Amino acid sequence: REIITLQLGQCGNQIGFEFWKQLCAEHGISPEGIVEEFATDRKDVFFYQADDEHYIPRAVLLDLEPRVIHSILNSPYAKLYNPENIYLGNNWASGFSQGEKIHEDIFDIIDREADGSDSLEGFVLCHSIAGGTGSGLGSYLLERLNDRYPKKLVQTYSVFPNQDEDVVVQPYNSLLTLKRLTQNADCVVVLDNTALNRIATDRLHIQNPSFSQINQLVSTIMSASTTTLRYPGYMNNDLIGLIASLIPTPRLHFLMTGYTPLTTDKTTVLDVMRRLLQPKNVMVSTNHCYIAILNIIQGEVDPTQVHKSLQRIRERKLANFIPWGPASIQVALSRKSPYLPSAHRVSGLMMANHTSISSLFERTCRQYDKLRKREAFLEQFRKEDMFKDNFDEMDTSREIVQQLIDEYHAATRPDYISWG
Amino acid sequence: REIITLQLGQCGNQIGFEFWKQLCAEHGISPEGIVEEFATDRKDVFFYQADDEHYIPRAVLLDLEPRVIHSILNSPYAKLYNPENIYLGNNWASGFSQGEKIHEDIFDIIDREADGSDSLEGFVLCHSIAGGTGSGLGSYLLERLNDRYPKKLVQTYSVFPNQDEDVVVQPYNSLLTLKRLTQNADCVVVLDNTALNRIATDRLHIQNPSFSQINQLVSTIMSASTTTLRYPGYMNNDLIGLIASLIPTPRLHFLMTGYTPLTTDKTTVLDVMRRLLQPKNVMVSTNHCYIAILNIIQGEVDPTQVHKSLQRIRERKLANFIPWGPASIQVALSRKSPYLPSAHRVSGLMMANHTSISSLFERTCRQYDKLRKREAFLEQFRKEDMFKDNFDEMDTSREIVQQLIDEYHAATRPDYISWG
Amino acid sequence: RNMKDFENQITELKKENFNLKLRIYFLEERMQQEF
Amino acid sequence: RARNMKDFENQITELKKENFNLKLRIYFLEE
Amino acid sequence: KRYFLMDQGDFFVHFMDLAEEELRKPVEDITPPRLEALLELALRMSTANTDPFKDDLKIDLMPHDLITQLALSGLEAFSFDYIVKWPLSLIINRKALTRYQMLFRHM
Amino acid sequence: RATNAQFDSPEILRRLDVRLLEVSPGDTGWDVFSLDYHVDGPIATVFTRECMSHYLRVFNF
């Protein structure tokens, strides 16, 4: 079945909207939704059919307060992403509860715009993990969405706050959302801003702009990580099966992406994944493993050097990974989006459940713990005081995420049935 | 399986930069490093394929004094030596302690040579003697390579500034390296700059460039010596195999250079060997036996009648052939490239062990004693007396150079196991 | 993969397809006669 | 004494293919 | 290739999103007009819609659950047929397309 | 594949192949590795059974 999407935090709205703008610009889709384009492609998976042959983006925008969202709406794309959901605080409690005071549309839209489907397979959130508007907001959405649709998917692509280093509410708001994400989401594809700036500085020099350049890669990669659904091949055109192939555990579902050309905007299937499986080409910053590695082939779509290719990866080792059991790796032969030019035709993308993310869970845990045990940076806000009166709800997150770092270490070791 | 090379100290680096130009003039690679000349020979061991068609050489080049290193960085031959393998001192001790303080990041270059390769095969240092930026740095870097990659060679070509007297620290710098050239290096192809100065000014009567004219001998000798890396053969497909029978016994690896057509800038099948054992290429300027003899032959040389050649020397006894035992010729043969500015192609080159070079080691002993007994011509910077207080390593080096004299003459004994 | 029993392994592939062909000959020659 | 090895790892296949191929033709021929 | 070798991997997601009412019922309740209508709809809603020979295509039935090696609808019994023409029957032909349908059953 | 002989022709680089030699009660890999060398076509009268047999008997030495 077809899929629905959401976008939250001023950052999360920006990357969700720029994703949908690039996603439109790679399909045969006219700026007013019409599938008239000559530039072949099942738009029905992510775009909703309407009677004007409007293939409308199933986009649930979710800021808190309107500063960003109108400068988002004014575009050459304003009529396209139109489910009539454009309704409107810097702290997780404000994001959470100033959404919750108005759940009767900016959460009931989960059903009100289910008419935006013939029948959903589920939801794809874009979440700013500590974004002062979106963090908190995404978590009440996420925990209540399990009550409305326990039968259907809830993936999140989440942008993670790490800025070389700071904002004094950021570690709090990030660690609060991670507890909800790990308990209530089905998959949480994390995006390291630090690693995306390392990619931008290995490409050229741009570290000081530390976000706007990331938006380019994230828009093209959020499209690319749905391109496997939206254009036919033999297998994995469906998100339910695509993501099932990576996630062997109900809680540690943290995918991370990698991509062979640093420049996203001739070399064999033996070799394109050999670049992809290197420390500099993956969005990250000991005994560690990837619990799965889906990877994608285009350009040299050689049908038969694939079975040989992993033996060549094995012979010069490259990707070491072996947990308590079989970690899945898949070499998905794929296709061009039918609008696009053929620039950097020979290419590879990966998505992998990298056990190393425990290191960033530990970093945000420590950054929470120093500012919590100094007891000064609770910020005294009114929603933070009425939902979270003695700030034990701060530590309620930390009891699970501090467990969760050791859980990923135990999920790396041979015997995770002894649960951390 | 590539022998990595480590040019070091400005003396070593000016034979090095001349050597890369001399190699690129005759080998099948463009001045920018591309396979491009004209429009079938063993690049791999010494040069290997990049993504932009540059065949990456194994070519690290380092010293302390940046006197002119920037020109080596911005030169067009940097586009030959792509890996950015150049990193930034006249006294042995300052050069060595600069080595100590930079020793991790200069070992780090080996990984960039390995990424410019398939895999390791040991090391050649084009090692400055009597030039602290190498006659000190190199003795340190040697003491780091040899214990970490013991499986293959860590050979050190000693270009040796003895010039009949430049810098007045030469006996001290050479003696402090001579502990390393005996018992921390494992092959030492040794080049007396006095013999190279006299011989180069006999190629043509220009006696002005004191070291450039030396480079012009060394680079041509080096190019003939690298043929075993650059050319295929049933035998003679690596440099260790060329060096092997020339070292007669383990600490005595002081291999003197010898080349027949030093005016190469048509010698017969006899004379590639007969001219090779004579004052024109005995690179020294009373028992002085050759301890071992072997050569590489190149050009349009007659491949069969070489059996005639040593059977002439059997009567002439030019090798002064009464050592502990024979270690005689193995007649390696290799082709000469097209395109190059050809003269006297038909030729032979040896790196033999000859008890004449004992006289050089005795001359630097005399230069050392005639200064040391007076405390004379130390650089007298107030930064020694801090790493060597009681001169115990200087005493160790002097007893090891006296052992080097005693061992070279003991190389004629009935049992070489007999001591001095 | 011993090679020194390919003598048997190929003799099986030989005798299998031989027996199959002659057995299909036995059944087609039945069809021929019955019709 | 000798065999090519590359002969074995084909001479199986050229019988093996048409064997089960003829099998599967004949299932429908039994009627 | 699109149907039998399933080069269309966006076709049968529709078929399974539609035919669950078929894929469960006891023996002899076979209903081929419903199967042809399910094919026609699973074609139309998908991109599978787009090729011209989909109308030369058909739903057929198979009796045997791979036990040919030597309704209970679909799982043991699916078949498709790109219909023959006598001029074409010298190459693409039913008698040979039997072997082809066995590969499709497995896939 | 990573040799610089990669510039040789595809026909001669396909004429080479790999095989196990004649056996003994005692053997090793450095005595059993060899080419097989298929020679069919007209060159089956340039090369010949006796010459290839004598080459391959020489090869292991």
Swiss-Prot record, chains A, B:
GTP binds at A130, G131, G132, T133, G134, S135, G136. GO terms for biological process: cytoplasmic microtubule organization; meiotic spindle organization; microtubule cytoskeleton organization; microtubule nucleation; mitotic cell cycle; mitotic sister chromatid segregation; mitotic spindle organization. The keyword Ion transport does not apply. Phosphorylation at Ser-119 by BRSK1 regulates centrosome duplication, possibly by mediating relocation of gamma-tubulin and its associated proteins from the cytoplasm to the centrosome. Keywords: Cytoplasm, Cytoskeleton, Disease variant, GTP-binding, Lissencephaly, Microtubule, Nucleotide-binding, Phosphoprotein. The modification Phosphoserine is found at S119. SMART domains: Tubulin, Tubulin_C. One of its GO terms (molecular function) is microtubule nucleator activity. It is found in: Cytoplasm, Cytoskeleton, Microtubule organizing center, Centrosome; Cytoplasm, Cytoskeleton, Spindle. InterPro entries: Gamma_tubulin, Tub_FtsZ_C, Tubulin, Tubulin/FtsZ-like_C, Tubulin/FtsZ_2-layer-sand-dom, Tubulin/FtsZ_GTPase_sf, Tubulin_C, Tubulin_CS. Transmembrane segments: none annotated. One of its GO terms (cellular component) is centriole. Tubulin is the major constituent of microtubules, protein filaments consisting of alpha- and beta-tubulin heterodimers. Gamma-tubulin is a key component of the gamma-tubulin ring complex (gTuRC) which mediates microtubule nucleation. The gTuRC regulates the minus-end nucleation of alpha-beta tubulin heterodimers that grow into microtubule protafilaments, a critical step in centrosome duplication and spindle formation. Belongs to the tubulin family. This is Tubulin gamma-1 chain. It comes from Homo sapiens. The lineage of its organism: Eukaryota, Metazoa, Chordata, Craniata, Vertebrata.
From Swiss-Prot, chain E:
It is found in: Cytoplasm, Cytoskeleton, Microtubule organizing center, Centrosome. It comes from the Eukaryota. Ubiquitously expressed. Changing A77P: In CDCBM15; uncertain significance. Disulfide bonds: none annotated. Component of the gamma-tubulin ring complex (gTuRC) consisting of TUBGCP2, TUBGCP3, TUBGCP4, TUBGCP5 and TUBGCP6 and gamma-tubulin TUBG1 or TUBG2. TUBGCP2, TUBGCP3, TUBGCP4, TUBGCP5 and TUBGCP6 assemble in a 5:5:2:1:1 stoichiometry; each is associated with a gamma-tubulin, thereby arranging 14 gamma-tubulins in a helical manner. Gamma-tubulin at the first position is blocked by TUBGCP3 at the last position, allowing 13 protafilaments to grow into a microtubule. Belongs to the TUBGCP family. It is linked to Cortical dysplasia, complex, with other brain malformations 15: An autosomal recessive disorder characterized by global developmental delay, variably impaired intellectual development, speech delay, facial dysmorphism, microcephaly, and varying degrees of cortical malformations including pachygyria, thin corpus callosum and subcortical band heterotopia. Most patients have generalized seizures. Component of the gamma-tubulin ring complex (gTuRC) which mediates microtubule nucleation. The gTuRC regulates the minus-end nucleation of alpha-beta tubulin heterodimers that grow into microtubule protafilaments, a critical step in centrosome duplication and spindle formation. Plays a role in neuronal migration. This is Gamma-tubulin complex component 2. It comes from Homo sapiens (Human). The gene is TUBGCP2. The chain holds residues 517 to 645 of 902 of the full protein.
Swiss-Prot record, chain F:
It is found in: Cytoplasm, Cytoskeleton, Microtubule organizing center, Centrosome. Ubiquitously expressed. Component of the gamma-tubulin ring complex (gTuRC) consisting of TUBGCP2, TUBGCP3, TUBGCP4, TUBGCP5 and TUBGCP6 and gamma-tubulin TUBG1 or TUBG2. TUBGCP2, TUBGCP3, TUBGCP4, TUBGCP5 and TUBGCP6 assemble in a 5:5:2:1:1 stoichiometry; each is associated with a gamma-tubulin, thereby arranging 14 gamma-tubulins in a helical manner. Gamma-tubulin at the first position is blocked by TUBGCP3 at the last position, allowing 13 protafilaments to grow into a microtubule. Belongs to the TUBGCP family. Component of the gamma-tubulin ring complex (gTuRC) which mediates microtubule nucleation. The gTuRC regulates the minus-end nucleation of alpha-beta tubulin heterodimers that grow into microtubule protafilaments, a critical step in centrosome duplication and spindle formation. This is Gamma-tubulin complex component 3. It comes from Homo sapiens. The lineage of its organism: Eukaryota, Metazoa, Chordata, Craniata, Vertebrata. The gene is TUBGCP3. The chain holds residues 606 to 666 of 907 of the full protein.
